[PDB]
Amino acid sequence: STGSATTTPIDSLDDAYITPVQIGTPAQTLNLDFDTGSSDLWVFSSETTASEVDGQTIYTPSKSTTAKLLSGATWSISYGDGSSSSGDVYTDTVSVGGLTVTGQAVESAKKVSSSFTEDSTIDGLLGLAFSTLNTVSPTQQKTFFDNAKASLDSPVFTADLGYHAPGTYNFGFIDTTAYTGSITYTAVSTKQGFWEWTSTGYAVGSGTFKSTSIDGIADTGTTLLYLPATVVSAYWAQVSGAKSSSSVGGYVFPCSATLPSFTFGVGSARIVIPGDYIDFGPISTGSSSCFGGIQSSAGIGINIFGDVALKAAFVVFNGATTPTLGFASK
């Protein structure tokens, strides 16, 4: 089997992307944030504290003939941005782009933090990291991909995120028309539960590529590119007027700037992020100061190849017995 679904930016900055997902019988379609940095599929629901719902579409398990309550099970997650959610657990039929998993754990939120409430466009998350990170207790549950894997034509999914435009998540096949040149594959460590890999270096603009190992995670659920302070400083030093602002919370630059590209290495291959992808717009409405899309990972504890990086590539998440990641230009 295969599946193919379009993913759509939630706003004009590509802050996140949402993908329609069918849950239950009859189908209830919710727009979920596919997150390769976490491993829980959780949704706003009829059980979510009413004052914490503000415009989201909710899952109502009592209206699904296929919903089953997982007796006594709970879940609770905290994300890197400090947001969180928790609740109880159902299993139900879940379909993405024509691919169906029966008995998928659907984690129903009883509580969500303010950042989730305040974002009316995201109805929940669909985790695509390794199932070892799943937070269900007492017994951990499998991700949608883990459950679908054995049925797929090939044990892979691909992320093809758009710049200020829709893109595609495919399951079970590689669309050879979706990229230019070849896909370069690189090793993955699953030791921390992430799609963790080692980039072979970077370049700033037209500068010569610097060969250096940069361990990080491929994370569709993170907006920006977070890299070591050395790398990030080298990038912003090429932007006139750029500076790190502790009050804003990162590097800012004059909105009138022409930003250089940023290149990262995948083996001997190279992915070039255009300068425009690094512009995240005015720091506040009407400001002439803009927020940068490449920021320091210092104090996160891990480097993150988030959407800024991933949307410059066609990315293969290969879930074979020994997982790997593939990157192609597009």
Residues taking part in catalysis: 35, 199
Structure tokens at 118: 């305040």
Peptide bond before residue 26 is cis, with ω within 30 degrees of 0 = yes
Rounded (5°) CA angle 310-313-315: 75
Contact 303, 296 (CB under 8 A): no
Q: Locate the DSSP E strands across 172-261.
A: 184-187, 196-204, 210-218, 225-227, 243-245, 250-254
Rounded CA-CA distance 229/312 in Å is 22
Rounded CA-CA distance 217/195 in Å is 5
Q: Cα separations (Å) of 266 from 8, 118, 275, 282? A: 26, 37, 19, 32
Report the candidate in 263, 290, 267 with the shortest Cα–Cα distance to residue 205. 263
